[PDB]
Structure formats: C-alpha cells, structure tokens
Amino acid sequence: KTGKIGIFQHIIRREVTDEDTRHLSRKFKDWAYGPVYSSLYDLSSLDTCGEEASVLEILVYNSKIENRHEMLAVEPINELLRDKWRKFGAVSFYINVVSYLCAMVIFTLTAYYQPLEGTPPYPYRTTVDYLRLAGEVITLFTGVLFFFTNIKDLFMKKCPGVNSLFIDGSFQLLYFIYSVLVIVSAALYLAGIEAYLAVMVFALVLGWMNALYFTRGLKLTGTYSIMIQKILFKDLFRFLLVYLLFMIGYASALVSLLNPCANVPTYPSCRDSETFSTFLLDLFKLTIGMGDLEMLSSTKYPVVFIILLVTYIILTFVLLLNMLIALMGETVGQVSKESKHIWKLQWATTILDIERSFPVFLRKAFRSGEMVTVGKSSDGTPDRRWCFRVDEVNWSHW
Amino acid sequence: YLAGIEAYLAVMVFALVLGWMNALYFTRGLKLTGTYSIMIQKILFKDLFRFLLVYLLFMIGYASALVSLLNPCANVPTYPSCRDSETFSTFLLDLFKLTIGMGDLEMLSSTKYPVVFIILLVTYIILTFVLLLNMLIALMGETVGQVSKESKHIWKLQWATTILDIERSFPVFLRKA
Amino acid sequence: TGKTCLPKALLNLSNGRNDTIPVLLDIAERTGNMREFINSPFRDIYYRGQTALHIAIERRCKHYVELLVAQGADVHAQARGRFFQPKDEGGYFYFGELPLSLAACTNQPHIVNYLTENPHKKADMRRQDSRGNTVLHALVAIADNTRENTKFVTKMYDLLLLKCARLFPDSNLEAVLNNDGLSPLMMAA
Numbered sequence: 216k217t218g219k220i221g222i223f224q225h226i227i228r229r230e231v232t233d234e235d236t237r238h239l240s241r242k243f244k245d246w247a248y249g250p251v252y253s254s255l256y257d258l259s260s261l262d263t264c265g266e267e268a269s270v271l272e273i274l275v276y277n278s279k280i281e282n283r284h285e286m287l288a289v290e291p292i293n294e295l296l297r298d299k300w301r302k303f304g305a306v307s308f309y310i311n312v313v314s315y316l317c318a319m320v321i322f323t324l325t326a327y328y329q330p331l332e333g334t335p336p337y338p339y340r341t342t343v344d345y346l347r348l349a350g351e352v353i354t355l356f357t358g359v360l361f362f363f364t365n366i367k368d369l370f371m372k373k374c375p376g377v378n379s380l381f382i383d384g385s386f387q388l389l390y391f392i393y394s395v396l397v398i399v400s401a402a403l404y405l406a407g408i409e410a411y412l413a414v415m416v417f418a419l420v421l422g423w424m425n426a427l428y429f430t431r432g433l434k435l436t437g438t439y440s441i442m443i444q445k446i447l448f449k450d451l452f453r454f455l456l457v458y459l460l461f462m463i464g465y466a467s468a469l470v471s472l473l474n475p476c477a478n479v480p481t482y483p484s485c486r487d488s489e490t491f492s493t494f495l496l497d498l499f500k501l502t503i504g505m506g507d508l509e510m511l512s513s514t515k516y517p518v519v520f521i522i523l524l525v526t527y528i529i530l531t532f533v534l535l536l537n538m539l540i541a542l543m544g545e546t547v548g549q550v551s552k553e554s555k556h557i558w559k560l561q562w563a564t565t566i567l568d569i570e571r572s573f574p575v576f577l578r579k580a581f582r583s584g585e586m587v588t589v590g591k592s593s594d595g596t597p598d599r600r601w602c603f604r605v606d607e608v609n610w611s612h613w
Numbered sequence: 614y615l616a617g618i619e620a621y622l623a624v625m626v627f628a629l630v631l632g633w634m635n636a637l638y639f640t641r642g643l644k645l646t647g648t649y650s651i652m653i654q655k656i657l658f659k660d661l662f663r664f665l666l667v668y669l670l671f672m673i674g675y676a677s678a679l680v681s682l683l684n685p686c687a688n689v690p691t692y693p694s695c696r697d698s699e700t701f702s703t704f705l706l707d708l709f710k711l712t713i714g715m716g717d718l719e720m721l722s723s724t725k726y727p728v729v730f731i732i733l734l735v736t737y738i739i740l741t742f743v744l745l746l747n748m749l750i751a752l753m754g755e756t757v758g759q760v761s762k763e764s765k766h767i768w769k770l771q772w773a774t775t776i777l778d779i780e781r782s783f784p785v786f787l788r789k790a
Numbered sequence: 791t792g793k794t795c796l797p798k799a800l801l802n803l804s805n806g807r808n809d810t811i812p813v814l815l816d817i818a819e820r821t822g823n824m825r826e827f828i829n830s831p832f833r834d835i836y837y838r839g840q841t842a843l844h845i846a847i848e849r850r851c852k853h854y855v856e857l858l859v860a861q862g863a864d865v866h867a868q869a870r871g872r873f874f875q876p877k878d879e880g881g882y883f884y885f886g887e888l889p890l891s892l893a894a895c896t897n898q899p900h901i902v903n904y905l906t907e908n909p910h911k912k913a914d915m916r917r918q919d920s921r922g923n924t925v926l927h928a929l930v931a932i933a934d935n936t937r938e939n940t941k942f943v944t945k946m947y948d949l950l951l952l953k954c955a956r957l958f959p960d961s962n963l964e965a966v967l968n969n970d971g972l973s974p975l976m977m978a979a
C-alpha cells in the first residue's frame with residue numbers, strides 16, 4: 216500500500232534454509248536437474264479468493280501509483296495475472312465487449328428509427344415500434360446499471376483522485392455521464408419535452424467513445440488509447456488556450472472592419488447580429504485547412520483586412536498547428552514506455568474487476584497455483600501452502 | 614469473360630491495382646527503396662489499423678448521432694434538407710472527407726436542433742483531425758525511428774532470399790559455372 | 791517408476807559421498823545382478839531410460855561415475871523419457887540421450903575425458919541417440935546464445951572433435967548426419 220519495493224521484493228523471494236526456520240520461507244526449491252531449476256512461490260496472502268485481504272487487490276487498487284508497475288512486475292505477480300487471463304480473464308472480458316458493442320447497436324438503431332414529429336412520439340402499436348420499444352428499454356437498463364455500479368463504487372472502490380487517472384478514473388465519470396444522460400432523456404421523453412433527442416445524441420457519441428475502455432485487452436490498442444488522453448491533456452488544451460486567444464483577438468479585430476446594416480440587407484457585404492459568431496467558424500475552418508479565405512472585401516479598409524488574415528494563417532496554421540504535430544511527437548516519444556506501464560495496471564485492474572464479480576466458490580475453482588506439502592510443521596503437521604511453480608534455467612551456478 | 618457475365622471488368626480492376634502494388638516486391642534490389650517498402654507495411658500494421666479502429670468507432674458514434682437530427686421525407690423530396698435511405702451512407706463519406714481535410718462542413722442546417730449539430734461536428738474535427746490524424750503522424754515518427762534498423766536487417770533477408778530464388782531456378786551445371 | 795535402491799542412494803546423496811552404495815553393490819554380486827543392478831529402465835513416461843549412471847553424472851559425482859562403469863554397467867542407455875526430450879516436445883532437458891552426451895552438455899570435462907579413455911568399457915563419440923543426434927548435435931541443442939553457455943559449448947565441441955580425430959582417423963564426427971540430415975552446423979543454422 217505504501218510502495219516499498221526493496222522490502223516487498225525481499226519478502227516474497229525469501230528462501231531460508233535452516234530446518235527450524237523453513238516455515239518462514241516463501242520461495243522453495245521443488246526440484247532441479249542440471250541447468251534447469253524449478254522453484255515454488257507462496258501465494259498465501261497474494262491470492263486469497265474472497266476470504267482474506269490480499270496484496271494483489273491492494274496493489275492494483277489501493278497503493279502508490281508512482282511505482283505500482285514495479286510491484287506488479289515481480290516474481291509470481293506477473294505470471295499470476297497472466298494465468299487468470301487465460302482461465303477466465305480473457306474470456307469474460309470479450310463477453311463484456313460484445314455485450315457492450317451490441318448494446319450500442321441497439322442504442323443506435325433506436326435512434327435512427329426514433330420518430331421526429333410530435334410531443335412524445337409514443338404511438339407504437341406496430342411490430343416495428345414495439346421492436347424499437349425493446350431498444351429503449353434495454354438502453355435504460357444499461358443506464359440504470361452503470362448508474363448503480365458507479366454509486367456502488369461510491370460506497371466501495373471510489374474516492375481516489377478519480378478525475379484524470381489513465382487507469383479507469385476517466386471512464387468511471389463518462390459511464391456515469393452516459394448513465395445520467397440516458398436517465399434524463401428517459402425523463403423528458405415521458406415528461407412531454409421534445410429535447411429527449413438532443414440529450415440522447417450526446418449519450419450516443421459519448422457511448423461509442425466509451426468502447427475505448429475495451430481496448431484494455433490488448434497492449435496494441437490500449438497503449439494507443441492512453442496516448443490519446445495524455446495528448447488531450449498535455450498537448451491539446453494548451454493549444455486551444457492560445458488558439459482561442461488569437462481567435463478573439465483577430466476576429467474582433469476583423470469584425471470591426473465591416474459596415475453595419477444600419478446603412479443592403481447582406482451578410483457577405485454588411486454585418487449584423489451573427490457576424491462575430493460565423494467568423495469564429497470560418498476562422499476555425501481556416502486554420503484547420505478546411506475553409507477558404509474568399510476575401511469579404513466589403514470593408515472600409517480592405518488591405519489591412521487581408522494583411523491580418525495572412526498573419527492568422529501563418530501563426531495559427533503554419534506555426535501553431537504544425538508545432539502541434541511536433542509536440543505530439545515529443546509526447547508519444549516520452550509517454551510510450553509510461554503508457555506500456557499504465558496498461559499493465561489497466562489490464563490487471565480488468566482481471567480483478569472480473570474476479571471480484573464472481574462468487575467465491577467459482578473463484579476457488581479458478582484458484583491459481585497448486586497445493587503443495589512444502590515441508591513439515593507443528594507436531595509434524597505439513598505445510599499445505601498453495602504455490603505457483605516457476606521453472607528457470609541458469610547455466611552458471613552448478 | 615467466357616461465362617457471359619459482365620463483371621469481368623470489376624474483378625479485373627482490383628487485379629490491376631493489386632498488380633502494380635506488387636511491383637514493390639522489386640524494390641528489394643535496393644536498400645534505398647526496399648527499406649522504404651518495409652516501413653510502409655509495418656506502419657500499415659502497427660500504426661494504421663489501430664487508427665481505423667478508433668476512427669471508425671467515433672464515426673458511427675457521431676454519424677448515427679447526426680443522422681438522428683434530420684427530419685424524414687415522410688413530411689420536400691430533398692437530400693440537403695430531408696433525409697431518406699442514403700443519408701447514413703453519404704455522411705460516412707462526408708465525415709471521411711472532413712477528417713481528411715478534404716471536405717467542407719457546409720452546415721446542413723435543416724434540423725430540429727441546429728446548434729447541437731454544429732457543436733458535434735466541431736468535436737469531430739478536433740478529435741479526428743486535430744488530434745487523431747496529427748497524432749498519427751507522430752506515431753509514424755516513432756515507428757520509423759524504431760524500425761529503421763530493423764528494416765535494414767529484414768532487407769538483407771529479402772535480398773538474400775532474392776538471390777537464392779534466382780539460383781535455385783537455374784539448372785545445376787549453370788550454378789556450377 | 792521402477793526405482794530400486796541404487797538410484798535412491800544417489801538422488802539423496804549428500805556432501806559428495808555416501809557409503810551405502812559400495813555395500814549395496816558388494817551385495818549385488820552376491821546376488822549376481824551387477825549387470826542387471828546398474829541397469830534399469832525407469833518405465834515412467836517421464837523417465838523412460840534413466841539409469842544410475844545418468845544420475846551419477848548429473849550430480850557431478852565423479853567418484854561413483856568411475857565406479858558404476860567399472861563393474862560394467864552401460865554407457866549407452868537411451869534416456870528417452872518425456873522429461874528427457876526437447877522443450878518443444880513437452881520436456882525440460884535434452885542433452886542427447888546418453889551418459890557421454892550428458893557429461894558434455896552438463897559442463898563436466900573430467901567425466902567426458904574419463905568415459906572415453908576409461909579401461910573397462912567406453913562410449914564411442916560416434917553413438918547416435920534415438921534422433922540420430924550425437925554429442926555435437928546435442929551441444930547445439932542446449933546452447934543458448936549467452937556468454938556463459940556459448941563459452942563451455944565451444945570448448946567441449948572442439949575437445950571431442952579434436953579428440954575424435956586422434957581415434958578413428960576417418961570421417962569427421964561433425965559430418966555425422968542425424969535422422970533428418972542436419973549436421974551440427976546445419977542444425978545450429
């Protein structure tokens with residue numbers, strides 16, 4: 216829980232030899248034959264299916280995030296999670312994904328066949344509209360589910376600094392937002408209000424963007440999804456701060472050079488009541504390389520106007536947006552390894568979230584390791600310690 | 614073309630584009646072009662598929678979200694105001710052109726809620742063009758930096774395989790010459 | 791398994807020696823089974839062929855390896871058990887399948903010298919295991935590309951190869967194809 220590798224590493228691979236104090240060892244020497252050496256780690260605390268506190272629950276959930284990757288990269292812990300991934304972790308995760316991908320097909324088809332005329336578009340009485348009715352209900356089931364599972368985590372695993380962690384702290388919010396935002400739409404589709412739709416549309420785009428949670432079952436896609444969010448933090452906000460700051464600067468500067476419609480009712484010659492707003496979009500399209508200058512030219516001072524837009528392109532496209540590519544290259548180079556290590560925390564958290572969701576007898580069926588009589592203890596009573604074999608080779612210590 | 618069917622053409626067209634793209638095999642006789650052709654395929658694997666996975670995932674998300682905000686032609690027979698039976702599909706192309714920096718917004722504007730619509734396309738540009746496609750350039754730079762040496766070494770296997778495929782294709786007396 | 795007294799003595803050897811063995815062997819000729827006594831197929835499907843000599847060598851027990859051969863036991867027993875197969879057959883330690891192939895592959899030059907120029911019997915450096923693989927074929931099977939491994943592989947590879955030139959001044963032992971052709975160089979490649 217406190218992130219102390221030197222003692223933590225020492226305790227696990229503790230091999231004492233003298234006959235009295237051999238019950239204190241946690242790394243045995245099962246068998247050897249020339250240059251191949253088996254070894255047998257104790258999982259007494261590490262893996263306890265339900266009926267005890269365990270180191271592995273603590274590390275993956277309640278510990279220091281600064282070195283948690285070095286803690287999950289020691290002797291059984293790496294191969295103990297990989298073993299769970301084989302048995303149940305991989306499988307159950309890939310039921311969770313298709314269960315979710317399907318639920319977002321249903322939330323899609325119900326939106327493409329949601330009517331658009333009249334206060335609440337109830338009038339079902341039809342095989343199609345009853346099929347749509349299966350859709351909205353399955354949807355609301357997910358919303359109330361994701362709502363309770365997150366508030367279950369309120370009286371359970373929540374309240375670290377879960378707002379910007381790359382270790383599911385981000386998605387706990389967005390599934391909550393998805394959960395709230397389906398409930399509100401369900402409330403307004405029943406309370407008459409016609410903005411059930413607008414509130415739904417956000418929920419849909421938000422929901423597919425939650426399928427990036429399910430890129431955690433592959434280092435390939437999961438490391439990628441981590442770099443998206445870091446770049447979104449370390450690189451894109453500082454870019455929009457400046458970019459916005461320029462934009463109000465030039466836009467106000469450029470609106471000032473257009474004659475009012477107190478003159479002849481034109482936008483492309485005159486300016487009135489929407490001329491600021493559209494420039495923000497044109498000056499947005501313009502830096503994105505997506506809109507054309509197409510000089511307005513209906514201005515008191517036309518040549519100052521053109522000199523400014525060119526300084527907007529040079530600064531915002533040629534210099535800021537291509538610097539933005541450059542900064543990403545510095546980001547992805549810096550946070551690649553750091554993103555490999557987060558994923559290992561993501562992946563491990565995924566396994567135990569599945570495991571904890573099982574009843575205890577099922578966790579004991581998938582119990583990892585093998586029972587062993589490592590030695591003799593009180594009044595000759597053996598040591599019935601579950602353990603985890605790790606075969607090894609050194610062609611040096613004959 | 615012998616069984617009468619007129620899709621000899623469509624099947625041929627794929628074969629032609631596929632065939633010139635097989636001339637990259639013949640970049641193996643130069644480290645210059647052959648290392649290059651190796652980095653194309655790694656980037657196609659290690660960098661581009663993971664990009665299309667996400668990109669697609671966003672696109673169905675927003676597109677469905679944006680089709681939902683257009684009034685049917687059960688109203689007046691328009692596409693640029695109404696929506697019927699091809700409106701999903703074309704958005705996938707427009708929202709593809711849009712992230713590529715190749716299509717224009719040109720707000721449809723014939724929607725129950727027009728301002729939610731514009732707020733979404735802007736989030737599509739920011740996420741898909743400003744952030745994903747320019748991150749994609751960045752990732753390639755990490756790829757080509759990592760796999761340059763590894764691509765020099767593959768080419769040496771390519772080049773050697775080329776030599777022996779030729780040699781084996783000779784009769785023995787010529788190989789002894 | 792099929793284990794008898796003599797393995798159990800050697801497996802539970804301590805401090806380098808154990809004086810039970812010369813007596814159980816002294817008792818062996820009294821029963822008249824030395825041939826059959828230092829010879830046994832553990833018929834375990836993890837130990838199909840292991841003998842007391844295979845045990846005598848892997849324990850680095852020179853004193854008894856000189857013994858067990860002296861009473862004329864075997865130096866050619868094929869330790870074919872699944873344990874004694876390559877790691878891709880579902881095994882742990884391939885060394886060849888022979889005591890001479892073991893003493894080489896287990897970094898024991900003294901045994902390997904002895905087993906050849908020992909008086910009673912001697913394993914020729916030509917003998918093929920149940921794959922065709924001789925001792926040099928087997929040194930290529932255990933060599934990883936590490937410093938310590940590649941060191942003592944090349945020494946003994948030379949040693950036997952230079953040594954087998956003295957004897958049998960004929961076909962090089964490095965030319966002995968195995969049961970898929972591949973010589974020790976082809977087998978390393």
Ligand SMILES: CCCCCC/C=C/CCCCCCCC(=O)O[C@H](COC(=O)CCCCCCCCCCC/C=C/CCCCCCCC)COP(=O)(O)OCC[N+](C)(C)C
Binds near residue numbers: 517
């Ligand atoms: C760090 C450097 C920052 C530089 C900022 C840009 C500065 C410009 C300073 C000069 C100010 C010019 C003022 C023009 C006033 C104006 O607009 O006057 C007009 C008409 O036009 C003229 O009379 C000027 C004619 C000459 C044109 C050639 C200019 C050559 C410019 C060369 C330099 C370009 C720099 C390019 C950008 C390089 C940026 C790279 C770093 C990146 C960071 C930004 C108003 O007409 P009016 O009669 O009232 O009514 C209209 C009637 N009518 C005339 C149309 C019939």
Ligand SMILES: CCCCCC/C=C/CCCCCCCC(=O)O[C@H](COC(=O)CCCCCCCCCCC/C=C/CCCCCCCC)COP(=O)(O)OCC[N+](C)(C)C
Binds near residue numbers: 740
């Ligand atoms: C991580 C943050 C994610 C943010 C997501 C975007 C969020 C927005 C939240 C606010 C919701 C707004 C709801 C609008 C509802 C709507 O559409 O209402 C309408 C009309 O419009 C209004 O009444 C609103 C007028 C105000 C306009 C200024 C908005 C200022 C927005 C500023 C923030 C921009 C964010 C920009 C993107 C920055 C992204 C950077 C990170 C990158 C990741 C994405 C429906 O008209 P109706 O009367 O039913 O019929 C039509 C009749 N009529 C009105 C046309 C005559």
Ligand SMILES: CCCCCC/C=C/CCCCCCCC(=O)O[C@H](COC(=O)CCCCCCCCCCC/C=C\CCCCCCCC)COP(=O)(O)OCC[N+](C)(C)C
Binds near residue numbers: 301303306310
């Ligand atoms: C090297 C090994 C290779 C083997 C590979 C093949 C392995 C396949 C194993 C497949 C079964 C595991 C997946 C089942 C579905 C599952 O567990 O779905 C889970 C949850 O399910 C449940 O809640 C249902 C409870 C009942 C489940 C068991 C039924 C099957 C029993 C058969 C097991 C086979 C073995 C023993 C017999 C059983 C009888 C007693 C022993 C007798 C001695 C052998 C999905 O996760 P979710 O909670 O949605 O994710 C987190 C959600 N959150 C908390 C974040 C909101």
Ligand SMILES: CCCCCC/C=C\CCCCCCCC(=O)O[C@H](COC(=O)CCCCCCCCCCC/C=C/CCCCCCCC)COP(=O)(O)OCC[N+](C)(C)C
Binds near residue numbers: 407
């Ligand atoms: C903690 C979250 C909880 C959310 C709080 C908001 C909940 C509820 C507010 C909704 C009600 C407000 C309107 C009530 C009045 C009304 O109905 O007003 C309407 C128009 O109002 C609107 O359109 C309101 C805008 C809705 C969106 C709000 C933001 C939603 C959430 C934003 C977040 C999600 C986004 C994410 C971006 C993705 C990128 C991220 C990437 C991040 C990557 C890491 C008037 O029009 P009218 O046609 O006349 O309506 C019919 C009325 N009549 C005639 C029948 C009586």
Ligand SMILES: CCCCCC/C=C\CCCCCCCC(=O)O[C@H](COC(=O)CCCCCCCCCCC/C=C/CCCCCCCC)COP(=O)(O)OCC[N+](C)(C)C
Binds near residue numbers: 617618630
């Ligand atoms: C293992 C490969 C084997 C391929 C299996 C496919 C083979 C055969 C299927 C063809 C027959 C199907 C149609 C029969 C009916 C028909 O004729 O239907 C037509 C239209 O049908 C089509 O158009 C069928 C689509 C053809 C393309 C399929 C894919 C081809 C292969 C795809 C792969 C190659 C690409 C590579 C991409 C490059 C990038 C990579 C970079 C990688 C870099 C590393 C109906 O129209 P109508 O005018 O009425 O026709 C006349 C009929 N009438 C009136 C005369 C009776």
Ligand SMILES: CCCCCC/C=C\CCCCCCCC(=O)O[C@H](COC(=O)CCCCCCCCCCC/C=C\CCCCCCCC)COP(=O)(O)OCC[N+](C)(C)C
Binds near residue numbers: 310315318364
């Ligand atoms: C060896 C194979 C054995 C197969 C056994 C199959 C057994 C049962 C089938 C049903 C499984 C349902 C399991 C749900 C578990 C669960 O709770 O799922 C959730 C996901 O949300 C739901 O489920 C929504 C609820 C509504 C139901 C689903 C939609 C409607 C029904 C669909 C079922 C049929 C599917 C597909 C049919 C087509 C299949 C094509 C195959 C093709 C193979 C390539 C897991 O999210 P969570 O982890 O909790 O993450 C939350 C995020 N947070 C908080 C951790 C950050």
Ligand SMILES: CCCCCC/C=C\CCCCCCCC(=O)O[C@H](COC(=O)CCCCCCCCCCC/C=C\CCCCCCCC)COP(=O)(O)OCC[N+](C)(C)C
Binds near residue numbers: 312429430432436
């Ligand atoms: C979003 C939810 C979550 C998704 C997660 C799962 C996503 C995808 C599944 C992919 C699994 C296989 C990839 C394993 C790669 C791997 O393991 O290693 C990769 C190597 O990759 C590759 O070589 C190429 C990869 C691309 C292959 C494409 C074929 C798979 C997709 C299926 C075909 C899709 C088309 C068409 C469909 C048909 C349409 C008809 C209807 C049409 C309409 C009618 C990197 O290795 P390395 O450099 O060592 O990095 C370390 C990573 N390491 C090994 C530790 C995990």
Ligand SMILES: CCCCCC/C=C\CCCCCCCC(=O)O[C@H](COC(=O)CCCCCCCCCCC/C=C\CCCCCCCC)COP(=O)(O)OCC[N+](C)(C)C
Binds near residue numbers: 456488489490492
């Ligand atoms: C910390 C200080 C914050 C102070 C904020 C004060 C907010 C508002 C004050 C303005 C009040 C009046 C607005 C009423 C709304 C409205 O409707 O206004 C319209 C005007 O037309 C428009 O199109 C709206 C233009 C809006 C101007 C925005 C200026 C710039 C604002 C800058 C804010 C951002 C700060 C900083 C960015 C930081 C960046 C780096 C990060 C640093 C982090 C710390 C009224 O139309 P009307 O007159 O009826 O007809 C049009 C005119 N006609 C035809 C009669 C001549």
Ligand SMILES: CCCCCC/C=C\CCCCCCCC(=O)O[C@H](COC(=O)CCCCCCCCCCC/C=C\CCCCCCCC)COP(=O)(O)OCC[N+](C)(C)C
Binds near residue numbers: 643644646
């Ligand atoms: C696709 C099939 C396979 C193709 C393979 C062969 C491709 C191309 C042949 C190029 C061979 C020469 C290049 C050797 C370069 C080299 O060896 O080293 C390069 C140095 O390059 C250069 O300095 C410049 C290179 C470009 C020169 C252009 C002139 C050649 C093309 C001919 C002219 C074409 C125009 C017009 C045509 C007329 C039109 C009229 C009709 C018009 C219509 C009527 C790198 O060196 P280093 O940095 O040490 O890297 C290590 C590489 N190293 C040395 C180990 C191999």
Ligand SMILES: CCCCCC/C=C\CCCCCCCC(=O)O[C@H](COC(=O)CCCCCCCCCCC/C=C\CCCCCCCC)COP(=O)(O)OCC[N+](C)(C)C
Binds near residue numbers: 317669670698701702
């Ligand atoms: C694993 C689960 C897979 C489930 C797939 C289920 C497939 C299909 C279900 C839909 C059946 C109905 C379709 C009939 C075809 C047709 O013709 O439909 C048209 C509808 O119009 C269209 O334009 C087609 C729109 C298609 C919607 C797609 C939704 C989204 C699909 C998402 C699939 C991809 C999943 C995941 C991506 C993963 C990404 C990350 C990697 C993860 C790897 C594991 C019928 O027209 P009609 O009604 O006559 O007239 C129009 C309507 N009007 C005018 C009457 C109102």
Ligand code: NA
Binds near residue numbers: 504713714
């Ligand atoms: Na462009």
Ligand code: NA
Binds near residue numbers: 505715
């Ligand atoms: Na253009």
Ligand code: NA
């Ligand atoms: Na254009």
